[PDB]
Design a protein around this ligand. Structure first.
Ligand code: AN0
Ligand code: AN0
Ligand code: AN0
Lengths: 320, 321, 321
């Protein structure tokens, strides 16, 4: 296991052993508290965060690491992302100096940088997250980039294994309405990871909301929500803005009929309800559904500490 | 008392005597229990500003060798929707109902600061928010100032009065003072609550209309004449608060600068010490001269916030499963 | 020199030789003194933005096994009233006079960053604020950049020049450069102050009207012809600063892009290295090509900020009561 970064499911290697370490740590949280002694983790945020912000610090502490959270934009200087521009305006520092500089004071870097929805190529080529990998001079892990969110998916995996009633459950990812255009990072990431399992994976969303093929893989895509839900064992709801052609980053619908309510859950095999959070109640899911005992939203969130501890541990183990 | 499950009111601290004992024990030997909280994580959550609580609590946690995570919800996280059963099709991204449980997932103890909102007296006085953390965080919760109390502060105030008192049962007078904005009655309520728990001679003095909730006032003497209350006092605890009674909940009834604690009033005291929880608006709450006088123990007071916090944190730790 | 009570100017570091010695000692063995600062708490206070100082200082403190509390006053705390004897019946909730002492209550060492306000030259140059922390914090105070100096930076600059110099006494040229906003002369002042303390050949080059305070310029050669100053330089330290003399204090006299350090000027140097404290506005202060060239040691420089901080912090620790 030579983890040099953590941005996609490939980086975690064999899911079996990965899950093994996961539950090992769930059972004995501070087992490796000495592993990261005198090792410093730098968490950088370009966007808001409750779970990632908190869960990652806890994870680092579980490994006895030093933690430095940097909310660039608030305490530091707004960065100029484009190269070859005359910085005679708004920005004081260029990303080109910033990244290297930040790498100077830590051993591992965590970066959260939501898709900007300004240019699909820029977003999907994951320019920013890649520059940290290229010039930080340190191992970099994603706290959600423009197109993936491995730390989240990994946790989702852990919780499904943790709660599944059979070896290969039917896991259905469903779109839901949201008032703002959200990245497809979570959906992309979830699919990517589910496709890596032997689960029966199905993706259901409205017309026009198809995700990038490379992520969809060969998962069944059902345009009829009620159909996809039939006999599901797990429902993973999440909204995302359009991706195809002329609608990149746009809201094509706010059809409240997709709001995961009791109507749809009923058709499932008494499936559990999952969501990465934050969640807008009575938009993505009904108060009753999320409050029902089938909702494992919290246990899920909880596992974020685990996924992070494992990834952090791996990265540490491979530090020079 | 040694079964601390939370810390929101004076009842939670148990026997004042032993509590004060631990306090001075730690004042003397600050890191005596530095190993107690090893690998134990404290989560401090702020919904409002803070200098003293923000700083003093982190130091306290470190004194116990704990891990500290300060979260300024609203800045780094997502604004929460507090009301239940609403359609979150607007401003907010996350609901308090998910937020609290989630936060509990990553720590062992939680500290919350949530000022009274002055929107609905019942909501504030039923301490809905602070209680939901207690109900759904799944962790021991301590108040960094709720809507109606501020135990961490009062406890420190107690420690400092004991620390400086010249006699066994001093006359401690709490006095209202003018302020340009409507402030919570959390500090006053809390102070009374704690003073009433002592054998001190406690007196509360404020303008007409500013009476505090009876359950807090207890049976403390209420003097509407400031100069009278001040007579022969040993300690003066000044603090402003907005009206509470009936139609004026959360409102400024007066900004009478005559109540500003100046030399005029101190003179009538028994050379009393001056106290205030801070922040303090100079020449509004108290005169520059008074606060700068040697009778002002404002800082030593503030300093004790580290102590009160260390003790509470220690107790909470000791009772962690 | 070995009894550090504060760190605001080059005098505080003592003998440069031994100072540099410790510097490289730590560069080689980063956590050598990780036990030195155990159970010692550092409080970093920011009144202005910061990437390098904010990060480098926390790392430094960790290298010494210290506790770190970063406080972004203004965001999490209460805006302070700086002027004394005012009636705080407005905007501010807390006065600097209470704030400083209070903050000192919870730490062992304090780091403060407070940019020059450019409102009154005397106020800025008398370094009123940074001095009040020294006067009333009750703790050793070190500058994270005050109104007129930035020792932590200069010390690092020194370390990197020694680290890269090709001869015993290189020609180090500090050059002004255009900037759209009026910047403090703290970095330039500080750089000169430290260079003047070395046996290097030091030259300062800037446009007419931008002369720095004499006490800082010392007896360094001042060349108004940029191209002349650059001739055969071994190190180029670029940095913008607003006017200082008489009627133009804190003002932009020029934005002459001819001073932008580009290849044109570097060519005339002795293949000199390029330095800058950062942040840097590309194609304003320096050309993309210049800063990206291999002669640019901008990052190695920034990196040394961790070292300068670790040394200063170590010294301060060693002299704690
Ligand atoms: C972790 C989720 C972050 C974000 N959600 C929102 C609502 O901003 C997203 O969809 O990527
Ligand atoms: C610690 C005091 C906090 C607050 N003060 C202000 C000014 O908001 C209050 O009166 O509750
Ligand atoms: C490192 C200090 C940077 C600062 N510059 C700005 C942009 O305010 C200054 O000139 O002091």
């Amino acid at each position: 296991s030579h983890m040099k970064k953590f941005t996609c499911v490939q980086d975690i290697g064999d899911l079996k052993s990965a899950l093994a370490e996961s539950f090992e740590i769930k059972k004995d949280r501070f087992k490796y508290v000495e592993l990261g002694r005198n090792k410093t983790l730098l968490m950088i945020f370009f966007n808001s965060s409750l779970r990632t912000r908190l869960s990652t610090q806890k994870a680092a502490l579980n490994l006895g690491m030093n933690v430095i959270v940097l909310d660039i934009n608030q305490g530091a200087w707004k960065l100029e992302t484009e190269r070859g521009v005359i910085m005679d305006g708004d920005k004081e520092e260029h990303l080109l100096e910033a990244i290297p500089v930040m790498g100077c004071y830590c051993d591992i870097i965590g970066v959260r940088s939501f898709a900007r929805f300004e240019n699909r190529e820029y977003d999907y080529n994951e320019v920013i997250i890649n520059q940290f990998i290229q010039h930080s001079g340190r191992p970099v892990f994603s706290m959600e980039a423009a197109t993936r969110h491995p730390l989240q998916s990994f946790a989702d995996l852990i919780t499904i294994e943790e709660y599944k009633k059979t070896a290969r459950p039917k896991v259905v990812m469903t779109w839901a309405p949201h008032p703002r255009p959200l990245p497809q990072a979570v959906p992309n990431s979830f699919a990517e990871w589910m496709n890596a399992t032997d689960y029966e994976f199905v993706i259901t969303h409205p017309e026009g909301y198809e995700l990038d093929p490379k992520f969809v893989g060969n998962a069944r895509v059902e345009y009829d929500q009620m159909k996809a839900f039939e006999g599901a064992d797990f429902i993973y709801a999440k909204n995302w803005a359009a991706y195809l052609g002329d609608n990149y980053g746009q809201i094509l619908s706010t059809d409240r009929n997709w709001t995961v309510g009791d109507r749809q859950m009923a058709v499932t095999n008494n499936a559990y309800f999952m969501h990465c959070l934050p969640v807008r109640r009575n938009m993505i899911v009904t108060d009753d559904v999320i409050e029902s005992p089938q909702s494992i939203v919290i246990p899920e969130a909880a596992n974020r500490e685990i996924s992070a501890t494992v990834v952090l541990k791996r990265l540490l183990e491979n530090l020079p």
